[PDB]
Amino acid sequence: APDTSVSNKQNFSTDVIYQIFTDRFSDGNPANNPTGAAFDGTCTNLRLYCGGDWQGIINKINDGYLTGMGVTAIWISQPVENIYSIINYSGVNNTAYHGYWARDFKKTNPAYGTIADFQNLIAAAHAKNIKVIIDFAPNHTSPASSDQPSFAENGRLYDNGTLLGGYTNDTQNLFHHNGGTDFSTTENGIYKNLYDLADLNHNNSTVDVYLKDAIKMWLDLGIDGIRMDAVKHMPFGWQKSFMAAVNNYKPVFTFGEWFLGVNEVSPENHKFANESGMSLLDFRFAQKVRQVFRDNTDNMYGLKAMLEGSAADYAQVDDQVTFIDNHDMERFHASNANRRKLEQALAFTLTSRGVPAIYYGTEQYMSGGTDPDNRARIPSFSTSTTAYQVIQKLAPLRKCNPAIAYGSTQERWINNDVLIYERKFGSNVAVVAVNRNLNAPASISGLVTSLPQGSYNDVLGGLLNGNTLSVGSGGAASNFTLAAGGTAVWQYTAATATPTIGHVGPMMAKPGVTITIDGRGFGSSKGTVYFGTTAVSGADITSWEDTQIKVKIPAVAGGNYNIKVANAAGTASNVYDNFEVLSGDQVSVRFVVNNATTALGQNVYLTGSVSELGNWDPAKAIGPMYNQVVYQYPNWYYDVSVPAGKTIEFKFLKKQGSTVTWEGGSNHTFTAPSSGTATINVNWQP
Numbered sequence: 001a002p003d004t005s006v007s008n009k010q011n012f013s014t015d016v017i018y019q020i021f022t023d024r025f026s027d028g029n030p031a032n033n034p035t036g037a038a039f040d041g042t043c044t045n046l047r048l049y050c051g052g053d054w055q056g057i058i059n060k061i062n063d064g065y066l067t068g069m070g071v072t073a074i075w076i077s078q079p080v081e082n083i084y085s086i087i088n089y090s091g092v093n094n095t096a097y098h099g100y101w102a103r104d105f106k107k108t109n110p111a112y113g114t115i116a117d118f119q120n121l122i123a124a125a126h127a128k129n130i131k132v133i134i135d136f137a138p139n140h141t142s143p144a145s146s147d148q149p150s151f152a153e154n155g156r157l158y159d160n161g162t163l164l165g166g167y168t169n170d171t172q173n174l175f176h177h178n179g180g181t182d183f184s185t186t187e188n189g190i191y192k193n194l195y196d197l198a199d200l201n202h203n204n205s206t207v208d209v210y211l212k213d214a215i216k217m218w219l220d221l222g223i224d225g226i227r228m229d230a231v232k233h234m235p236f237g238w239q240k241s242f243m244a245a246v247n248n249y250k251p252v253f254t255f256g257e258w259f260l261g262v263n264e265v266s267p268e269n270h271k272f273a274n275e276s277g278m279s280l281l282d283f284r285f286a287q288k289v290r291q292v293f294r295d296n297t298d299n300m301y302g303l304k305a306m307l308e309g310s311a312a313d314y315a316q317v318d319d320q321v322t323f324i325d326n327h328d329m330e331r332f333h334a335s336n337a338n339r340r341k342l343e344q345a346l347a348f349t350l351t352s353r354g355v356p357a358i359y360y361g362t363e364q365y366m367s368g369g370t371d372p373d374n375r376a377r378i379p380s381f382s383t384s385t386t387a388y389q390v391i392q393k394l395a396p397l398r399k400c401n402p403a404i405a406y407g408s409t410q411e412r413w414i415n416n417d418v419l420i421y422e423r424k425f426g427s428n429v430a431v432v433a434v435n436r437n438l439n440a441p442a443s444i445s446g447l448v449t450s451l452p453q454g455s456y457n458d459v460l461g462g463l464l465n466g467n468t469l470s471v472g473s474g475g476a477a478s479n480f481t482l483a484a485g486g487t488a489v490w491q492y493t494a495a496t497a498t499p500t501i502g503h504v505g506p507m508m509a510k511p512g513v514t515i516t517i518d519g520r521g522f523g524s525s526k527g528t529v530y531f532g533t534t535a536v537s538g539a540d541i542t543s544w545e546d547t548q549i550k551v552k553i554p555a556v557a558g559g560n561y562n563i564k565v566a567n568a569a570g571t572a573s574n575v576y577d578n579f580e581v582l583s584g585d586q587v588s589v590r591f592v593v594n595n596a597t598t599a600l601g602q603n604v605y606l607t608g609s610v611s612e613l614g615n616w617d618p619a620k621a622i623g624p625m626y627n628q629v630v631y632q633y634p635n636w637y638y639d640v641s642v643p644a645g646k647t648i649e650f651k652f653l654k655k656q657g658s659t660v661t662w663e664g665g666s667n668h669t670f671t672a673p674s675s676g677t678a679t680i681n682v683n684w685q686p
């Protein structure tokens with residue numbers, strides 16, 4: 001199948017995602033609507049159920065709303081059973097309409113539909129080449145109080161109907177009882193409650209095994225991807241172990257929510273996206289798009305630095321899910337705003353690197369402040385808006401123009417208000433010119449591109465006041481005027497002769513797991529695939545076609561490898577780096593080291609005998625370790641994904657910058673559990 005196939009669960013870079021708050025989209029089956037105080041059919045009270053369901057989505061998938069817009073994937077609210085309580089928060093009634101208050105991850109929220117409804121949703125979507133992403137929020141259950149067990153459902157957790165436990169009398173330690181986080185440190189936000197949400201303890205084996213089994217049920221139901229909630233709030237090591245359970249079973253595109261504020265750039269965020277086994281929602285891209293196009297708090301140079309910085313910071317920048325707004329921001333379109341600002345921000349996102357995501361109703365110019373005001377029912381299903389047309393014209397290019405799906409990004413012309421950038425992949429090119437200045441045109445001269453000689457019509461057809469471009473020898477464009485608020489897209493497409501890799505997924509799995517290598521010019525006959533210097537060919541290459549290769553990971557030692565392919569004639573492709581071969585199935589193990597005193601600016605890290613612990617390379621040690629919450633300095637702790645059942649030798653390190661101090665004495669040893677979790681507690685050896 002081609003890289004662009006609906007069947008490709010590992011690559012969403014050629015797709016355009018439409019994020020749907022299920023309850024607020026379309027009530028296709030009134031019979032499953034919640035009743036009484038939990039319901040508002042008029043959807044005036046945005047905190048109660050308005051009736052939106054899976055049957056309504058199936059309807060809008062079948063009547064052309066989404067397909068006519070060029071949407072090729074949907075990301076829907078968490079599908080699992082939620083508590084039924086109507087929680088009164090200081091005089092105001094609140095319902096689980098959002099799907100974030102799970103009670104049973106093995107069942108459906110009956111308000112959305114049954115299991116059968118879900119299967120129908122999956123089938124209806126696939127029949128229309130639309131992929132289905134589900135939200136999954138394994139960080140907590142629901143609002144709970146230990147001392148007031150009658151409040152809400154006491155964060156109770158069930159396993160397909162069977163009670164596992166609640167927040168009160170949590171003798172099993174299913175949850176954390178450390179108070180609530182003030183978001184003051186990352187450690188603090190991981191091990192303390194988010195608001196009043198009962199925080200799940202992933203170090204509890206029952207919780208661990210349960211969540212990993214629950215996701216398998218969803219994978220079996222045919223989902224194509226997962227949107228993980230609150231990733232900055234669960235142990236990174238446990239999450240890596242959770243991504244390995246997914247990938248070592250049935251891999252699907254996964255991205256997590258890790259909020260970043262205006263002007264925030266977090267190296268922690270980068271390393272997570274780079275090493276966890278899941279990518280992230282691109283808040284850095286989104287917040288910068290809002291400053292430049294929405295709020296006027298930064299200009300094109302700042303958009304350019306974000307583009308260049310992110311391409312450098314994210315190992316797979318093309319896996320980052322971009323957007324201009326979501327359920328946790330004020331709607332991009334301000335009631336009083338010029339619509340062109342939204343149109344432009346949209347055109348920019350759709351033609352930029354990564355995986356574009358559109359919040360439902362953006363194409364309808366919905367406006368609204370923060371929660372729950374950004375979550376109104378979609379007021380119209382009109383295909384006639386300028387915004388809808390922009391998406392319609394640009395969304396499909398991610399499938400037909402691989403420069404947009406996988407290309408590099410290059411600035412070709414720039415000033416405070418204008419940015420002309422170029423995407424390129426193999427024999428494919430796309431050039432986009434944007435003039436944020438809504439009152440002043442710009443005179444464009446000296447623009448040089450990789451576009452072949454000729455006249456190029458604006459793909460948007462002048463919809464956003466774009467123009468035709470004339471390119472001469474050298475890719476030099478003749479002078480032109482870029483209209484006020486003008487936006488234009490020019491492209492060139494042709495068959496690619498040399499093997500070129502545009503994407504790899506999943507990026508972490510154990511040997512034997514099948515990976516998907518997508519791009520152009522692989523040719524029709526099986527060639528060779530390389531993992532580092534190791535060559536794979538023949539039977540282990542399950543399938544091979546010009547744009548997509550399916551191959552089994554060889555049984556090489558656990559570690560990081562660069563992927564390269566060669567065609568049947570032996571011509572090599574570019575190298576796609578950072579593939580991580582796991583040492584085997586993974587379990588989440590908590591390491592604890594006592595009496596590891598440090599100087600300010602120095603932290604403790606873990607290193608050891610397996611690739612999962614960096615193979616004794618301080619440059620790859622695990623950390624920095626924690627020392628506030630579960631244990632207190634000078635005792636440090638950290639949850640780490642390690643190979644199940646393996647006997648592993650380890651040591652702790654004190655690092656400052658790249659300077660390293662090793663624990664003295666002999667290595668410590670332990671044998672990882674074959675399943676579930678474990679905790680190893682040792683003393684720092686001088």
Ligand SMILES: OC[C@H]1O[C@H](O[C@H]2[C@H](O)[C@@H](O)[C@@H](O)O[C@@H]2CO)[C@H](O)[C@@H](O)[C@@H]1O
Binds near residue numbers: 411412413414446447
């Ligand atoms: O001609 C090559 C040149 O193109 C662009 O330079 C623009 C510049 O961004 C504008 O602000 C203005 O000065 O016109 C220049 C071209 O005449 C690229 O930005 C630049 O890197 C490139 O060398």
Ligand SMILES: OC[C@H]1O[C@H](O[C@H]2[C@H](O)[C@@H](O)[C@@H](O)O[C@@H]2CO)[C@H](O)[C@@H](O)[C@@H]1O
Binds near residue numbers: 598599601627
């Ligand atoms: O909270 C983490 C903190 O740990 C390390 O600092 C120790 C410090 O070395 C001791 O001198 C003492 O002051 O307790 C600190 C922890 O409260 C790291 O030095 C520091 O960078 C890190 O944030």
Ligand SMILES: OC[C@H]1O[C@H](O[C@H]2[C@H](O)[C@@H](O)[C@@H](O)O[C@@H]2CO)[C@H](O)[C@@H](O)[C@@H]1O
Binds near residue numbers: 616651663664665667
């Ligand atoms: O480099 C491989 C080597 O790393 C670790 O050895 C440490 C040792 O523990 C330290 O006390 C100090 O001497 O530095 C060595 C690294 O240069 C592992 O302990 C050892 O097994 C491993 O082979």
Ligand SMILES: [Ca+2]
Binds near residue numbers: 051053
């Ligand atoms: Ca309904």
Ligand SMILES: [Ca+2]
Binds near residue numbers: 192
């Ligand atoms: Ca947590």
